[PDB]
Amino acid sequence: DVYAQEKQDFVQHFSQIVRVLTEMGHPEIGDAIARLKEVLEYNAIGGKYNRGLTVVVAFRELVEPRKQDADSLQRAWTVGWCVELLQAFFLVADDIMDSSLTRRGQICWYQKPGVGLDAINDANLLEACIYRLLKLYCREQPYYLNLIELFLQSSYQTEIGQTLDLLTAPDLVRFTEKRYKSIVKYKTAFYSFYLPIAAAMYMAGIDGEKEHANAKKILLEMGEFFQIQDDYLDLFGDPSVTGKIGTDIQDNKCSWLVVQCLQRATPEQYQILKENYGQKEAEKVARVKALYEELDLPAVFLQYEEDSYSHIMALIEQYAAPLPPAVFLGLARKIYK
Amino acid sequence: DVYAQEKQDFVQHFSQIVRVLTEMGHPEIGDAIARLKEVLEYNAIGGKYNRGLTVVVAFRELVEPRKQDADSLQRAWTVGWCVELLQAFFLVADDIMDSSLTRRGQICWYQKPGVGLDAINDANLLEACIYRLLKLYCREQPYYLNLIELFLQSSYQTEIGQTLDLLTAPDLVRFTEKRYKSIVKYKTAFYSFYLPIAAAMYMAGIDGEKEHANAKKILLEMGEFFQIQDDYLDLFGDPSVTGKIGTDIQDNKCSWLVVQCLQRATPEQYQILKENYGQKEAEKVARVKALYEELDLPAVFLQYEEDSYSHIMALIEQYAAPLPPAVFLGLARKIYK
Ligand SMILES: O=P(O)(O)C(Nc1ncnc2sc(-c3ccc(C4CC4)cc3)cc12)P(=O)(O)O
Ligand SMILES: O=P(O)(O)C(Nc1ncnc2sc(-c3ccc(C4CC4)cc3)cc12)P(=O)(O)O
Ligand SMILES: O=P(O)(O)C(Nc1ncnc2sc(-c3ccc(C4CC4)cc3)cc12)P(=O)(O)O
Ligand SMILES: O=P(O)(O)C(Nc1ncnc2sc(-c3ccc(C4CC4)cc3)cc12)P(=O)(O)O
Ligand SMILES: O=P(O)(O)C(Nc1ncnc2sc(-c3ccc(C4CC4)cc3)cc12)P(=O)(O)O
Ligand SMILES: O=P(O)(O)C(Nc1ncnc2sc(-c3ccc(C4CC4)cc3)cc12)P(=O)(O)O
């Protein structure tokens, strides 16, 4: 596995990431820097690192091996960790706003004794660390500004996505397909799928607008597919297999499932849905599920997967050049659950 | 007044700022953009605009009038508003973290019905808008990257400052002068005093490290002075004159007053302080005040002002060149209350 190959080195680099972000020529910010260390250690560690690793895998596939000096790699690892820091920023903040209890098999940072709403500042520090790292490791590089702009834009797009999600889910009237597709695109797909390849692209000197537009077209369609899958597996997944015990229905999400359900429902079924969506009790969660089954949404999903395979293989056929197909295909394999 | 002269045009530009940040080639983010308009309108408007205006005043004092085309000015106004957007980001967030009720004579944004902790995202959008504006108005300019780095660094320094404030005020043991001075420097002085002049400097082609270090030396010392004044006036100000009804003691702040009080107190006075600092009731707030009076902290302040005048005039004498002294002196006059 091309990701398993890169992994150990990527994770070991985290140690260096931290050292450099904390190491006291100015003594009396010491205490704040110590808090910064704790924030990084708790929140940047424990994921699958798919997004950060994608930077490293893509880098290796896109830069001729004659230009993979010890130093270029340090940079690749660093930029990968920059993506992981972006993720951490979003998730610390998202947990506060959703009033979540747990994340990545542990108490959400803001819920830890004596953190609370101070986590808002902590989240912002994580974001800040992106640009500090980019400066320290890539200031002299020709792609420096490209990377700054890409990260800032990725942040902007994600935040806009979050705004749309927040407005959409404060009433099922609002849960349309055009709306669902739009949330997924801004809120997850840009920073999860486009950003990591795009970074690698810029680090490899592939900076053209067309090349970027082409990679983007593939990657946003991949990101939509993987989010829709995520929505399906939330309910009909086997949690021992996926790792997620679904709570989308209780949590009242604009999920792909509900959108499809809404499109198909008779007026009376709308009512059963209006009646049971977003409740604690299993009794009710089971009536929503049983409705999705009644409307045969798994078959609808299966069909969506089949269609979606053809479309995405075709997209890569057409739009991958002059990147290696394996960049796209390697990422698909890694994310698919 | 050089600020009153620039003001009407600066504030009128806000309209343009908004238009450009909202104007629907992508239709289905419409609703999110509408929310963005509301966030800007509520949170970026109603201050004195000292920091944003400083960019515009400094620009005019630093660029020869032959290079003050309609376009250079648009840019100056825009960059000024970028400082105002940074301020707004910090304050929306700070209000959430402090659990404040009011700001700028109105309900804090997060306290408005149906905003709540969604304000966290809103705060981040305000930050994002800085870099969108910088791109739209200054991408082709030679100082573009300088401005990106300055804003990102200003954010980093402020956040670090906030971390230090949060750690320092979660116990009077912690309220030392080295610590107080350090909070003020990172949390307020860099972005309130250095950032706006520095931006103008870069827009004028003054990009040298020495020149920046020199401006910085003056401006951080100015920022310390104005924060210490702010602390004094919180208690001994006349609120009808200043506009602030002080609540530093109740709110348990690391204020200059308490630091000085701590340095002077006998063991028994420490106890009266330990006993009354951070309470609701006036009875107790009056015993803290009466102690500061007992220890004659106003005289200590007066002396601090006198010393501080000589020092800062001397700093400008020595370090202002090749900037016009009036940049520094104009800002002092404007902020002094
Ligand atoms: O209550 P305030 O606003 O008068 C005052 N707060 C501030 N005054 C001046 N500048 C700043 S910058 C600042 C801050 C707050 C939150 C953040 C979070 C985004 C990370 C960053 C900076 C708070 C603050 P304080 O009495 O808590 O010291
Ligand atoms: O994962 P499987 O083999 O158990 C099964 N998967 C599929 N079954 C039938 N047709 C298809 S097409 C498909 C697929 C996989 C990857 C992609 C990636 C390019 C995005 C697109 C479609 C998975 C799949 P399901 O239990 O998720 O329904
Ligand atoms: O297990 P199978 O083959 O009988 C069948 N699976 C499939 N049938 C038809 N086409 C496909 S494509 C497919 C697949 C799964 C994972 C991937 C990962 C590289 C992304 C790609 C394609 C599974 C599958 P299903 O009855 O479990 O849905
Ligand atoms: O609960 P989760 O984390 O599984 C999920 N949230 C997310 N999943 C994937 N990507 C993202 S990016 C995102 C977000 C949250 C807060 C912000 C605030 C800083 C502005 C920005 C982005 C939330 C999120 P959802 O079930 O609320 O959709
Ligand atoms: O403002 P005033 O005239 O009523 C009086 N101000 C002063 N009185 C005596 N000495 C001084 S030195 C001083 C000053 C003003 C501006 C500065 C700016 C360069 C930072 C530094 C020191 C104000 C002042 P106070 O009521 O604040 O004590
Ligand atoms: O009103 P005053 O002159 O009798 C006396 N004020 C001063 N005495 C001696 N030196 C100075 S310098 C000073 C001042 C006030 C505002 C400024 C603003 C430009 C920043 C500068 C200097 C007021 C002052 P105070 O008894 O009110 O403290």
Side-chain angles (χ1 to χ4, degrees), chain A residues 88-125:
Chain A
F89 160 56
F90 299 148
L91 288 188
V92 162
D94 183 57
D95 289 338
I96 304 163
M97 298 184 265
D98 295 348
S99 299
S100 293
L101 298 183
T102 302
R103 152 90 56 213
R104 275 168 193 173
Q106 44 171 37
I107 294 175
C108 304
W109 176 247
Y110 84 99
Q111 283 286 354
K112 300 284 278 168
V115 176
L117 294 170
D118 295 355
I120 292 163
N121 186 61
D122 298 318
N124 286 312
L125 279 174

Side-chain angles (χ1 to χ4, degrees), chain A residues 39-47 49-63 65 68-177 179-242:
Chain A
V39 168
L40 287 159
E41 281 173 349
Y42 191 94
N43 292 294
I45 282 286
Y49 311 115
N50 289 327
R51 298 173 183 66
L53 274 176
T54 293
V55 176
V56 175
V57 172
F59 171 74
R60 277 184 187 288
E61 290 172 359
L62 283 176
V63 172
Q68 304 182 22
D69 51 288
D71 282 340
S72 283
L73 257 164
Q74 288 260 294
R75 287 191 290 278
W77 295 329
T78 298
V79 169
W81 271 108
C82 290
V83 179
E84 290 299 314
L85 291 179
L86 188 68
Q87 165 74 318
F89 160 56
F90 299 148
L91 288 188
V92 162
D94 183 57
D95 289 338
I96 304 163
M97 298 184 265
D98 295 348
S99 299
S100 293
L101 298 183
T102 302
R103 152 90 56 213
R104 275 168 193 173
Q106 44 171 37
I107 294 175
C108 304
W109 176 247
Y110 84 99
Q111 283 286 354
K112 300 284 278 168
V115 176
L117 294 170
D118 295 355
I120 292 163
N121 186 61
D122 298 318
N124 286 312
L125 279 174
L126 287 160
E127 177 193 33
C129 280
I130 294 168
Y131 306 96
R132 295 191 62 227
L133 283 179
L134 286 180
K135 193 175 172 217
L136 280 160
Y137 283 88
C138 313
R139 46 171 264 160
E140 292 311 305
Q141 303 300 305
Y143 58 69
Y144 176 49
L145 179 54
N146 284 335
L147 286 186
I148 285 162
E149 290 193 343
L150 171 60
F151 273 93
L152 294 161
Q153 163 146 260
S154 297
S155 299
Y156 176 67
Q157 304 256 57
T158 304
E159 290 164 6
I160 273 295
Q162 178 62 0
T163 299
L164 206 53
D165 200 25
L166 291 173
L167 295 169
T168 297
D171 195 15
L172 308 158
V173 165
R174 283 197 274 247
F175 294 173
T176 70
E177 196 175 12
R179 172 52 59 96
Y180 172 79
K181 278 177 145 77
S182 223
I183 292 169
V184 166
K185 170 173 172 179
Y186 282 96
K187 176 164 141 154
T188 64
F190 191 101
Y191 90 95
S192 302
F193 289 90
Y194 173 66
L195 157 64
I197 299 298
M201 289 172 63
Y202 286 118
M203 293 179 80
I206 311 171
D207 63 348
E209 295 218 304
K210 194 68 217 150
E211 297 94 77
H212 279 270
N214 282 346
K216 177 173 300 174
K217 189 160 165 59
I218 292 157
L219 289 166
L220 291 171
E221 184 59 33
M222 283 183 42
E224 185 169 289
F225 171 85
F226 287 115
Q227 189 54 58
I228 291 173
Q229 176 179 83
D230 199 56
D231 295 352
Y232 179 84
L233 288 177
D234 197 79
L235 186 58
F236 294 104
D238 185 67
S240 47
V241 162
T242 70

Side-chain angles (χ1 to χ4, degrees), chain A residues 31 121 124 127 144 149 163, chain B residues 121 124 127 144 149 163:
Chain A
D31 285 11
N121 186 61
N124 286 312
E127 177 193 33
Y144 176 49
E149 290 193 343
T163 299
Chain B
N121 186 61
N124 286 312
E127 177 193 33
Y144 176 49
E149 290 193 343
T163 299

Side-chain angles (χ1 to χ4, degrees), chain B residues 225-226 229 302 305-306 309 313 328-332 334-336:
Chain B
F225 171 85
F226 287 115
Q229 176 179 83
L302 182 73
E305 287 181 305
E306 294 165 10
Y309 187 79
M313 288 298 146
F328 299 108
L329 300 158
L331 175 63
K334 183 72 177 104
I335 311 295
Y336 183 99

Side-chain angles (χ1 to χ4, degrees), chain B residues 133-147:
Chain B
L133 283 179
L134 286 180
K135 193 175 172 217
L136 280 160
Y137 283 88
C138 313
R139 46 171 264 160
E140 292 311 305
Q141 303 300 305
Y143 58 69
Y144 176 49
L145 179 54
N146 284 335
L147 286 186

Side-chain angles (χ1 to χ4, degrees), chain B residues 247-265:
Chain B
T247 46
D248 281 1
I249 300 162
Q250 310 91 300
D251 293 346
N252 201 258
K253 302 296 177 38
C254 192
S255 157
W256 181 86
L257 285 174
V258 82
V259 163
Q260 295 297 315
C261 177
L262 279 157
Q263 260 159 35
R264 295 181 163 64

